[PDB]
Design a protein around this ligand. Structure first.
Ligand code: HEA
Ligand code: HEA
Ligand SMILES: CCCCCCCCCCCCCCCC(=O)OC[C@H](COP(=O)([O-])OCC[N+](C)(C)C)OC(=O)CCCCCCCCCCCCCCC
Ligand SMILES: CCCCCCCCCCCCCCCCCCCC(=O)O[C@H](COC(=O)CCCCCCCCCCCCCC)COP(=O)(O)OCCN
Ligand SMILES: CCCCCCCCCCCCCCCCCCCC(=O)O[C@H](COC(=O)CCCCCCCCCCCCCC)COP(=O)(O)OCCN
Ligand code: CUA
Ligand SMILES: [Cu+2]
Ligand SMILES: [Zn+2]
Lengths: 78, 268, 51, 38, 55, 99, 236, 530, 114, 117, 52, 128
């Protein structure tokens, strides 16, 4: 009887500026699914984080940067 | 007595004659500012009006310095109280010239301490090949460090009383401020990241680009002191056109030693 | 004004002894400084089609 | 046996004239609102 | 060298100071030419550039 | 610093005045302090007007004594203490003159 | 909420994080009236009762026991003011437990909201854009320059976290009734947290300058009840 | 004279530029408040550009071309050599280039408005709005070359003022025995020296982003536009105190002269005036409390902005104690100074509420800020500018100024300018945003009230022009009959009128002991002090 | 005569104290010229001529590394990032000239729209 | 034959302050290459006397009109600040003691006779 | 014998600051006890009904 | 001595007295005060008080008798001319707002009252 539910505190990013909370969760989702996706559940917890608090013009931007191999942050741990 | 003493000034301060140099320089900055902000949006077609407006600003300022050299040794109204004013007046100008590099030190630290999301998490960003500090930038330092160690006996041998010793120490100081211009011109062409490669090609080519521009001004200021010492101007006890430049030489061997420890060693 | 100090002499105007009335060259100096935005209000509006 | 009144003769019209000029210097938007509510 | 003779000229001449050297007729006569050129051609491009006509 | 040390500082300065400028000056910074002086001070100020022979600078003494008195009865007690010095010299009050 | 013509106060509160601001501003102006009372009374006793004094008390310069007094007395006043300010500054960024996340991106002349948490039955991030209705396309009853077409709705009595940014020039996200203001710098994204105590529409404005149409983008927020919220969310 | 080097003929050329540009700063102020009198675009047709152009045209002309060249330029170059007894300024030729680069900076600003775009960025020329993607014209390039030519005007005058009052004072005048107006431009010429390189860097980093696409603040590239917010306001709040420390200098002299008393604790007045400039550097983020700064940083800048109320509050309480004990001669410079103690007080308390970081989130970029700084600029730096004229112009020009006509010019300013800026707090406390061409319909109340008072202030400027005209023509006739006031200090209560005429001026500064007007060589032999 | 006695009394001890402080101006400038001439030709200049040829040892191979880059044409250039060529308001002195000076061997600016 | 000075007693104006010739192959030694205003103060520093006066005024006695304070000038308007009799008594007050008219110090009481020279 | 009269203005700032605090104090007591407690009484009367 | 017709009522006679007599009557007076007082003439005793401490030249007020009534007659004729100058340019101006004219505001409240906008204070919105 409590439907609404989203990302909690995540005390490593406590201040007002959350410009890297979107980013670090985005890399850690693409690091999980490449470097040993153990199942699709226990690293789509990151997918619930970066689908919130990231604009839908930002997500298609980094989807293009990783498409042409020109993405900034390292997503290939291998 | 009181007849010949009344035929001079009563205060040591110098009252200059009215001369039309501060108005012509003012009509050279307007003709620079108008010809610059027109030619960058088309509106002219060629880079000829800036190449003349910057030329008339250089000539109308070298004729201002044609008056002060005549006002200091052909009429010579620089007394003991006037020379303290010029030495302190330049010392306030060099404070703004130092603090104008704090705007280009804050720009680097705001772009490196909190790294950006558009570029990578690292600094310098991925792909950009940074400048190695164990190479030709170190040669840019040791040339410049010895420059501050070879102008300071060209000043002391001037007071000692021999021209041929003090002139040799100024000729081999003027070449060090044109070797450093050359070896920071070679590095500015054999690099791999432009002015428009994000921020690491931007804050780097302004904190060192402005410092490169001042070394042209220091080599010109070290040029007139070679001309004046050859043409018998600077005495052994009255040289404010030379003690001004030693201040500018050591202070540029201070902000370079911040540029070297930050933009090269701390950057990579 | 480097010579001939006096009451009306330290000003770059010419108040007394003028061939014209002075209030022409006084109020006609500040109205130039008051109608200089309206010519910028004019030629920027006229450039924008409206009148 | 005198000194309280000789200041009281002066200050009592001072604290009334001051509130008269402060309520005009601060409360004058209360007059423009009261008339034209339209 | 040539400094005491230039002290005799620049003192007691009653000319404007920038004119006082003998080698000054061929400095300012070219300089007043190229200054009057370089100060009007920025002003002359102003009313054409306000309307919006460029190269 | 004190009040008795204020009297013997201005009982001296009205004994060395020699001129009209050095009476109206000494009377100016005799009333420009905080307290109004005792009449032993102001007796010398009337006497030092006869040293310089000027009457209206001895009338403004009793015109400034009225302003700096802080209580209307005290103006009637300064005048009553100056029984003789106002009468031996002959300088009148400004209100009795009615100018 | 709605501004009133000829008003002199805040708009009506809708947030405990804005209810504290009204408690802070009235506690601050309680002390800025004693000082204005002291200044404007000293400036009328001195002007009236010393424009007539002819003998100038020109022998007081130092005043040692009164210079020490007006050094610690503004230091006492500002220390009293700071403790409501330091409590409210910390207790306005308690983002510890939100319940819904809303993004809001400003595209230089209009807003764009998106409730991208997958909490509904469709399976997509719901998003829309909100433009001000023009003066030609008005209807008699709308609030001009305040009432847009497709507003943003939120539930009541639940914590909501906004995430505000832009993909164009810098412009602000400001609602006076909720008391939130973050300038939406396009390199970054800020966040505020503010639950709404009572349902009803709130209007806002954009305060940072963005260009030509800086005034033509309001932020209509109409908080609705939660069973009425999920009717709108599952539909649209 | 055209290329003159005389250090006090430049100061009257400065003053023929203030009242010129302050007219255009008022005419641009007229159109803004005329368009805001009613909802709907009345006088401007539908154009929101040319309203955001006439705001930066109005804020640059009033700050950088009215208050700065008259407080620092006008009363600076005339009175800093005179009150220390210097013959001229220290460097006389760069004192001339500090003037003549201002009309070239005036041409570069009017030509920034006539070009097809118009700078629509506001006074704080924010980066992505003023980047080349938004303002594609060359308009704002000329609008920052004007700020380049003005920055090198105020810098090259500030170097001239530091090295003047450091070694060109007279014999017995030590630094402790200095006038308060000399100390006030001496503190101010250090802040102009320590803040203008931060501006002239941050402006150039904006010029390189447009014409050279170097991305100092362009987002595609990692250039954060909050860096310009940090870089401009490190100039911006020192620039704010530069316009008001000479405002504290003139009021410290008009009070001490028209009330025959020295300044109460003068050596404690100079410490408070110097601890504003040192503390002025430690606050710049109170203009950006809501850009996304972390909570400990907002907790610092709300404390260090509160500390500025301590030395400013000392200076207000020192001025109250100075006029307390002494006589008061209510001439028109004293009327401007006695209203400076009230209108700067109400504009200083409004900044205290604004200084709170947790309260500024309901106040930033509303009209509660615009009603705040006009109470300390249009009433703090203009009242002292009007007081500075009426206190010294019978000495400078030599002609009196029809005193009983100058009383109504003050009274039409005080009740005039208070009708604009007092309801401006009501628009901001209700939620009216800043820099809008037209507002929502619930703001037609106080925007009509604050528009009537714009004409009362503008008619006051026109009355000032006639006083400025009546001072020149038949100004000599005003000191032979009973129009004006001649002696600023009336004689004491026991001063004879025939003995007052021997020692007339009881001044505590040099500039009233000179001849009226002063000679071109006013000190051909040095003066001696005690 | 009237208004002309003299100017001032001779202090006569500041001289041979100011001049005696000026005799040490030469005496101090002799040693501090000798102190700095040895470090500028036998300390600093050994550091110049030793490392200038060390720097000219990496010039012959880094220009060879520049000769390696245009040896192969390499149309398969690494496809530089989003920030590597900012071109809003293209440059006014040249056609597509990136800076005031750049060798084309390492500043190619290959456009890949695809 | 203008005959440069080499001592303070023989100046006769700016015609004789030129200085001797400069030697070739050496520095100017600051005595042979001055011009005529810093040349004059150099001749003063080679003696004991300083040429430009920098001295605070006599603030040890008050001085009546029978026994004033003299202030040696070269014009008729030498401005005087007379902050007190032990030079710390009152605030400053500026005076212009001209020829045949003393100034009288309305606060302190000093008298200043000019002695114009 | 006139008694020594002194301190006529020391009693005119102690009795002026006291009537400067007590003239802004009953100007600021109207704000916090008569205006701020007017709006905050209208709040917690209105919010008393929205639990019913 | 000195004539009674000379210094009688030296209040209005001192102004518009000629300058060569104005400094002459004090030279007749200042010789006479080298005498024990209360022997002087009673209008002569008044007359020296007007010379040394009168309201003439110095000690003139900053505003005359007809200035405080002139200041209020220039301020109120500047207000009632500025607002008169306000209506002239307010007449020659643009068209009024469409939604301002009192017909929206009767039923924009019905939009607000249906949504409970301002529970305290007021949402009345009626400005014509
Ligand atoms: C120098 C400071 C200064 C001064 C004096 C003024 C004066 C005035 N200003 Fe301005 N103003 C600013 C600085 C100043 N302003 C700034 C920084 C901004 C913000 C810009 C932006 O937002 O980016 C601003 C913005 C601003 C706005 C914009 C609000 C918003 O953003 O929407 C408005 C509109 O109401 C306004 C109005 C006025 C008015 C009515 C005056 C009236 O006071 C003018 C009438 C007063 C005079 C008549 C006296 C001055 C005239 C003289 C020539 C002086 C003569 C005296 C001597 C030389 C002896 N100002
Ligand atoms: C030039 C004049 C001037 C002066 C002197 C000041 C002085 C002050 N200003 Fe202001 N200010 C401006 C002009 C000025 N300001 C401008 C132009 C802007 C920005 C507009 C824009 O962004 O475009 C601005 C912006 C500005 C802001 C930014 C708000 C916003 O944009 O979001 C803030 C907030 O902190 C602020 C506060 C202050 C404070 C605390 C002082 C203090 O120094 C004031 C000190 C004075 C007093 C406090 C009163 C005297 C004291 C007492 C009577 C006794 C003591 C009493 C107690 C302690 C209670 N100012
Ligand atoms: C006053 C008016 C404004 C004055 C400053 C404007 C000067 C603008 C100069 C821009 C010229 C230019 O093209 O900039 C680039 C230059 C050359 O550097 P580059 O060629 O880009 O280096 C890259 C090396 N590759 C790998 C490509 C081979 O890079 C540089 O060295 C540019 C240096 C410019 C530094 C200017 C800083 C000024 C600060 C304020 C000073 C005010 C006085
Ligand atoms: C100090 C200066 C005081 C100024 C006095 C005039 C201000 C207005 C007084 C009357 C007024 O309209 O406001 C009343 C109180 O004002 C105030 O509280 C003024 C602040 C003191 C509130 O009463 P209201 O009914 O008008 O406003 C409530 C609407 N619900
Ligand atoms: C920034 C501009 C430079 C400021 C630094 C110079 C100020 C300190 C040095 C100085 O005082 O020299 C002034 C000229 O330098 C100057 O300021 C002339 C340089 C200005 C030329 C601008 C274009 C340069 C290319 C002389 O100034 P003065 O003539 O008044 O002293 C007359 C004394 N005999
Ligand atoms: Cu978006 Cu203003
Ligand atoms: Cu500020
Ligand atoms: Zn004295």
């Amino acid at each position: 009887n409590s439907p609404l539910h989203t990302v909690g505190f995540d005390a490593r990013f406590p201040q007002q500026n959350q410009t890297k909370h979107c980013w670090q969760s985005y890399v850690d989702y693409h690091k999980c699914v490449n470097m040993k996706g153990e199942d699709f559940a226990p690293c789509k917890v990151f997918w619930k984080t970066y689908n919130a608090l990231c604009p839908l013009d930002w997500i298609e931007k980094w989807d293009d940067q990783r498409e042409k191999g020109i993405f900034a942050g390292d997503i290939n741990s291998d | 007595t009181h007849l010949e003493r009344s035929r001079h000034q009563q205060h040591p301060f110098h009252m200059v004659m009215p001369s039309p140099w501060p108005i012509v320089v003012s009509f050279a900055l307007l003709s620079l500012a108008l010809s610059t902000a027109l030619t960058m949006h088309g509106y002219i077609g060629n880079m000829n009006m800036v190449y003349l407006a910057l030329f008339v600003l250089l000539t109308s300022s070298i004729l201002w310095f044609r008056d002060i050299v005549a006002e200091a040794t052909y009429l010579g109204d620089h007394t003991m109280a006037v020379r303290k004013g010029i030495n302190l007046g330049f010392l306030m100008f060099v404070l703004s010239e130092v603090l104008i590099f704090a705007g280009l030190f804050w720009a680097y630290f705001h772009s490196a301490m909190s790294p950006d999301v558009t570029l990578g998490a690292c600094w310098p960003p991925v792909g950009i090949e940074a400048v190695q500090p164990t190479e030709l930038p170190l040669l840019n330092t040791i040339i410049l460090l010895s420059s501050g160690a070879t102008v300071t006996y060209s000043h002391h041998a001037l007071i000692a009383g021999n021209r041929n010793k003090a002139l040799s120490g100024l000729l081999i100081t003027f070449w060090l401020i044109v070797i450093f211009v050359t070896c920071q011109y070679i590095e500015y062409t054999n690099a791999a990241f432009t002015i428009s490669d994000g921020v690491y090609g931007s804050v780097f080519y302004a904190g060192t680009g402005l410092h490169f521009l001042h070394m042209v001004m220091l080599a010109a200021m070290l040029g007139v002191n070679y001309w004046r010492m050859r043409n018998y101007h600077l005495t052994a006890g009255h040289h404010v056109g030379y003690e001004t430049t030693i201040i500018y030489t050591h202070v540029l061997d201070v902000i370079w030693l911040f540029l070297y420890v930050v933009f090269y060693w701390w950057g990579v | 004004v480097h010579f001939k100090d006096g009451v009306y002499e330290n000003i770059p105007f010419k108040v007394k002894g003028r061939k014209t009335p002075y209030a022409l060259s006084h109020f006609g100096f500040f109205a130039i400084g008051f109608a200089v935005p309206f010519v910028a209000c004019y030629v920027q509006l006229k450039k924008s089609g409206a009148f | 046996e005198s000194w309280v009144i000789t200041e009281g003769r002066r200050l009592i019209p001072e604290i009334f004239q001051w509130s008269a000029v402060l309520s005009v210097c601060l409360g004058w938007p209360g007059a423009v609102y009261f008339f034209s509510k339209a | 060298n040539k400094v005491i003779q230039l002290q005799k000229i620049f003192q007691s001449s009653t000319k404007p100071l920038w004119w006082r050297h003998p080698r000054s007729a061929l400095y300012l006569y070219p300089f007043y030419a190229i200054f009057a050129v370089a100060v009007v051609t920025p002003l002359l491009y102003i009313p054409n550039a306000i309307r919006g006509i460029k190269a | 610093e004190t009040f008795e040390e204020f009297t013997a500082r201005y009982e001296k300065e009205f004994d060395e005045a020699y001129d009209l400028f050095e009476v109206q000056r000494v009377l100016n910074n005799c009333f420009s302090y905080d307290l109004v002086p005792a009449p032993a001070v102001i007796e010398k100020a009337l006497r030092a007007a006869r040293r310089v022979n000027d009457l209206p600078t001895a009338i403004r003494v009793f015109e400034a004594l009225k302003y700096k008195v802080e209580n209307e009865d005290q103006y009637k007690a300064y005048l009553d203490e100056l029984k003789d010095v106002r009468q031996e010299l002959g300088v009148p009050l400004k209100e009795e003159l009615f100018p | 909420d709605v501004p009133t013509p000829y008003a002199c106060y805040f708009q009506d509160s809708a947030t405990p994080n804005q209810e504290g601001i009204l408690e802070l501003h009235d506690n601050i102006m309680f002390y800025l009236l004693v000082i204005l009372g002291l200044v404007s009374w000293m400036l009328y006793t001195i002007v009236m009762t010393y424009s007539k004094n002819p003998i100038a008390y020109k022998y007081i310069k130092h005043g040692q026991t009164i210079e020490v007094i007006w050094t610690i007395f503004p230091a006492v006043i500002l220390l009293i003011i700071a403790f409501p300010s330091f409590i409210l500054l910390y207790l306005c960024d308690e983002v510890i437990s939100p319940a819904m996340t809303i993004k809001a991106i400003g595209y230089q002349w209009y807003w764009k909201y998106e409730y991208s948490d997958f909490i509904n039955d469709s399976g997509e991030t719901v998003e829309f854009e909100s433009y001000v209705i023009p003066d030609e396309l008005l209807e008699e009853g709308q609030l001009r320059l305040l009432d847009t077409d497709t507003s943003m709705v939120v539930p009541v009595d639940t914590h909501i976290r906004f995430v505000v940014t832009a993909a164009d020039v810098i412009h602000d996200f400001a609602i006076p009734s909720l008391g939130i203001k973050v300038d939406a710098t396009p390199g970054r994204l800020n966040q505020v947290s503010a639950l709404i105590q009572r349902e009803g529409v709130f209007y806002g404005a954009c305060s940072e300058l963005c260009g030509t149409g800086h005034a033509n983008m309001p932020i209509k927020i109409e908080a609705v009840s939660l069973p009425k919220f999920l009717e709108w969310l599952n539909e649209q | 004279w055209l290329y003159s080097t005389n250090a006090k003929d430049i100061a009257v050329l400065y003053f023929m530029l203030a009242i010129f540009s302050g007219m255009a700063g008022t005419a641009m102020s007229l159109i803004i408040r005329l368009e805001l009198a009613a909802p709907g675009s009345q006088y401007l047709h539908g154009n929101s550009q040319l309203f955001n152009v006439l705001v930066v045209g109005h804020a640059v002309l009033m700050i950088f071309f009215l208050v700065m060249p008259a407080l620092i330029g006008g009363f600076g170059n005339y009175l800093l050599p005179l009150m220390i007894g210097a013959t001229d300024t220290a460097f006389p030729r760069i004192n001339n280039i500090a003037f003549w680069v201002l009309p070239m900076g005036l041409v570069c600003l009017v030509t920034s408005t006539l070009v097809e775009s118009g700078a629509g960025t506001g006074w704080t020329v924010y980066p992505p709005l003023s980047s080349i993607q938004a303002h594609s014209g060359p308009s704002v390039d000329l609008a920052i070359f004007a700020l380049h030519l003005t920055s090198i005007s105020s810098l090259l005058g500030a170097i001239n003022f530091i090295v003047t009052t450091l070694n060109m004072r007279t014999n017995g005048m030590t630094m402790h025995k200095l006038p308060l107006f000399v100390w006030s431009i001496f503190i101010t010429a250090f802040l102009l020296l320590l803040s203008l390189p931060v501006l002239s860097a941050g402006i150039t980093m904006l010029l390189l982003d447009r014409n050279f696409n170097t991305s100092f603040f362009e987002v595609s590239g990692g250039g954060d536009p909050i860096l310009y917010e940090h870089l401009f306001w490190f100039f911006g709040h020192p620039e704010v105190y530069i316009l008001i420390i000479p405002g504290f200098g003139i009021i410290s002299h008009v009070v001490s002269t028209y009330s025959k008393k020295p300044v109460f604790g003068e050596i404690s007045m100079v410490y408070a005036m110097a601890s504003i400039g040192l503390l002025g550097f430690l606050v710049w983020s109170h203009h950006m409390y809501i850009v996304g700064l972390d909570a400990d940083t907002r907790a610092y800048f709300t404390s260090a902005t509160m500390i500025i109320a301590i030395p400013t509050g000392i200076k207000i309480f020192s001025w109250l104690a100075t006029i307390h004990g002494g006589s008061i001669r209510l001439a028109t410079p004293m009327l401007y100074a006695i209203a400076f103690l009230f209108l700067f007080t109400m504009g200083g308390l409004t900044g205290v509420a604004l200084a709170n970081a947790s309260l500024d989130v309901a106040f930033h970029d509303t009209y509660y800020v615009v009603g705040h700084f006009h109470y300390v600029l249009s009433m703090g730096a203009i009242f002292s500018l009007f007081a500075g004229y009426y206190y010294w112009s019978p000495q400078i020009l030599g002609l009196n100024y029809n005193e009983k006509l100058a009383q109504i010019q003050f009274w039409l300013i005080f009740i005039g300018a208070n009708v604009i800026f007092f309801p401006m707090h009501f628009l901001g406390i209700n939620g009216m945003p800043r820099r809008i061409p037209d507002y929502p319909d619930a703001f037609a109340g106080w925007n009509y009230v604050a528009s009537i008072g714009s004409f009362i202030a503008t008619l006051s400027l026109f009355l000032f022009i006639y006083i400025l005209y009546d001072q020149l023509v038949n100004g000599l006739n005003n000191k032979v009959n009973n129009k004006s006031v001649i002696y600023n200090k009336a004689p004491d209560f026991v001063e004879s009128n025939t003995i007052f005429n021997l020692n007339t001026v009881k001044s505590s500064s040099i500039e009233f002991l000179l001849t009226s007007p002063p000679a071109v060589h006013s000190f051909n032999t040095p003066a001696v002090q005690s | 005569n009237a208004l002309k006695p003299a100017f001032g009394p001779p202090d006569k001890v500041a001289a041979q104290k100011f001049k005696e402080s000026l005799m040490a101006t030469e005496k101090h400038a002799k040693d501090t010229s000798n102190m700095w001439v040895k470090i500028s030709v036998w300390v600093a200049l050994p550091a110049i001529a030793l490392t200038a040829v060390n720097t000219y040892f990496v010039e012959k191979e880094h220009a060879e590394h520049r000769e390696h880059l245009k040896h192969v044409p390499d149309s398969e250039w690494p496809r530089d990032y989003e920030f590597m060529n900012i071109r809003s308001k293209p440059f006014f002195w040249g056609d597509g000239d990136k800076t005031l000076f750049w060798n084309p061997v390492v500043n190619r600016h290959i456009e890949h729209d695809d | 034959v203008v005959k440069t000075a080499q001592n303070l007693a023989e100046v006769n104006g700016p015609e004789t302050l030129i200085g001797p010739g400069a030697k070739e192959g050496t520095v100017p030694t600051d005595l042979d290459q001055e011009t005529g205003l810093a040349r004059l103060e150099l001749l003063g520093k080679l003696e004991g006397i300083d040429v430009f006066d920098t001295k605070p005024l006599d603030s040890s006695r008050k001085g009546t009109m029978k026994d004033p304070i003299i202030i040696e000038s070269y014009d008729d308007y030498r401005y005087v600040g007379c902050t007190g009799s032990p030079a710390g008594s009152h605030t400053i007050m500026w005076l212009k003691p001209t020829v045949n008219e003393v100034a009288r110090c309305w606060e302190c009481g000093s008298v200043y006779k000019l002695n114009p020279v | 014998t006139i008694a020594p009269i002194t301190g006529t203005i020391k009693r005119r700032v102690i009795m002026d600051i006291v009537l400067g605090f007590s003239l802004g104090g009953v100007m600021a007591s109207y704000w916090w006890w008569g205006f701020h407690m007017d709006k905050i009484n209208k709040r917690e009367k209105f919010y008393a009904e929205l639990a019913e | 001595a000195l004539s009674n017709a000379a210094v009688m009522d030296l209040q209005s006679r001192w102004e518009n007295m000629p300058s060569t007599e104005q400094q002459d009557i004090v030279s007749k007076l200042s010789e006479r005060q080298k005498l024990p007082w209360a022997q002087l003439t009673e209008p002569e005793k008044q007359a020296v008080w007007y010379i040394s401490y009168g309201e003439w030249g110095p000690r003139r007020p900053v505003l005359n008798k007809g200035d405080s009534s002139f200041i209020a007659k220039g301020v109120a004729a500047g207000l009632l001319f500025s607002v008169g100058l306000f209506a002239v340019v307010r007449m020659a101006g643009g068209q009024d707002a469409k939604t301002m004219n009192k017909e929206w505001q009767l039923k924009s409240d019905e939009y607000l009252k249906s949504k409970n906008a301002n529970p305290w204070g007021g949402y009345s919105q009626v400005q014509s």
